[PDB]
Write a protein that binds this ligand. Structure first.
Ligand SMILES: COc1ccccc1Nc1cc2cnn(-c3csc(C(=O)NC4COC4)c3)c2cc1F
Ligand SMILES: CCCCCCCCO[C@@H]1O[C@H](CO)[C@@H](O)[C@H](O)[C@H]1O
Ligand SMILES: CCCCCCCCO[C@@H]1O[C@H](CO)[C@@H](O)[C@H](O)[C@H]1O
Length: 341
């Protein structure tokens, strides 16, 4: 096993192999903090994320096993991927800290939206990569459900990777499909397509499409643009209070996207209209959206791969903290790094 060295960063203790040098904090999330480092084996800067209290409870323990098993499965250019996984522990009884290594990106999509003037070619390329990674993710039977700007890491090259959890260093509600906020409790993959549609609209206009103050106000803003739900959608709503409140609204017609997004590429307006429909069954899928004329300059059917089937059976099991702890330890030991290009 490699040699480790210890240091304190942000009132935290980091124990990492010697190969990673010059640790520098980037940001923090709710389940871990991220540092930039120099990988002496490759000469590249990487990103090292120390999980916060990985095995403090059953919930934390399962979440840790979930992220590790998921990340180990993600092998795609537009999806965050694992370059290395390490723990300072040399035994399972010592096992209590988990680190994850990945490529170091340039910034979040909030920082690229901060400039507020993206060229239409920037939107084609950025949204094409999101959709490309989303097709891979959705091919694994995986739904993201929390897509938002902080989840899109980009380099100055404009190359994009989808992150499972971004840096909290944006309410999230602004990018959630309406069914989620209705608590439908069983979502199509197209819930992510709705999020993508909300992101693309921001990149084009420079403003939040649905900057709602809460969940009801959010649904009210959505209704203004897309219009009141049709009779065939109201049938599918079981909650009477939900139906009653949606029906009891004053009712508004669907706005013409050509007007609200005037000045934008007409091919982008058509794509948005196919993404932001209330019926999840009618929303364009990631695969179909890649074939949209808006992406003619980047689309390649032979270079948009799918993922192997991902087994999420463990999600229904209720196990003890030590069982989740040992399975995670098993996944750390079984890790095989990808070959350096
Ligand atoms: C390594 O952590 C993980 C490990 C495994 C799974 C997920 C993660 N999370 C995670 C990974 C990445 C890679 N990049 N970024 C990033 C966003 S913004 C920025 C920046 O400002 N980069 C400048 C400053 O030095 C260049 C860099 C990340 C932010 C993250 F939350
Ligand atoms: C790189 C692939 C990203 C996988 C997305 C899962 C991590 C973000 O999603 C998380 O897990 C749940 C799974 O549906 C989501 O529903 C929750 O919103 C969130 O906690
Ligand atoms: C508040 C504004 C009306 C919200 C309408 C959202 C309709 C979402 O669409 C629905 O998604 C469900 C799963 O999430 C599917 O079971 C339904 O078939 C589909 O129509």
């Amino acid at each position: 096993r490699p040699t480790f060295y210890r240091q304190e960063l942000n009132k935290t203790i980091w124990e990492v192999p010697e190969r990673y040098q010059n640790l520098s904090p980037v940001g923090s999330g709710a389940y871990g903090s991220v540092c930039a480092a120099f990988d002496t084996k490759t000469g590249h800067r990487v990103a090292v994320k120390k999980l916060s209290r990985p095995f403090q409870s059953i919930i934390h323990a399962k979440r840790t096993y979930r992220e590790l098993r998921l990340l180990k499965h993600m092998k795609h250019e537009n999806v965050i991927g694992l370059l290395d996984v390490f723990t300072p522990a040399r035994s399972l009884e010592e096992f209590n800290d988990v680190y994850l290594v990945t490529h170091l990106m340039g910034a979040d999509l909030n920082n690229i939206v901060k400039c507020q003037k993206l060229t239409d070619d920037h939107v084609q390329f950025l949204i094409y990569q999101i959709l490309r990674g989303l097709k891979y993710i959705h091919s694994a039977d995986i739904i993201h459900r929390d897509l938002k700007p902080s989840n899109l890491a980009v380099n100055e090259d404009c190359e994009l990777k989808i992150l499972d959890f971004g840096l909290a260093r944006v309410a999230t509600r602004w990018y959630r499909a309406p069914e989620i906020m209705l608590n439908w409790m069983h979502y199509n993959q197209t819930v992510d397509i709705w999020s993508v549609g909300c992101i693309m609209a921001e990149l084009l206009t420079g403003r939040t499409l649905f900057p709602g103050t809460d969940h009801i106000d959010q649904l009210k803003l959505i209704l203004r643009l897309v219009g009141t739900p049709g009779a065939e959608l109201l049938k599918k709503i079981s909650s009477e209070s939900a139906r009653n409140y949606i029906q009891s609204l004053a009712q508004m017609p669907k706005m013409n996207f050509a007007n609200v997004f005037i000045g934008a590429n007409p091919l982008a307006v058509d794509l948005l209209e196919k993404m932001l429909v209330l019926d999840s069954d009618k929303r364009i899928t990631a695969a179909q959206a890649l074939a949209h004329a808006y992406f003619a300059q980047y689309h390649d059917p032979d270079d948009e791969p799918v993922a192997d089937p991902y087994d999420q059976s463990f999600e229904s099991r209720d196990l003890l903290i030590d069982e989740w702890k040992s399975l995670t330890y098993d996944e750390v030991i079984s890790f095989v790094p990808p070959p350096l290009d």
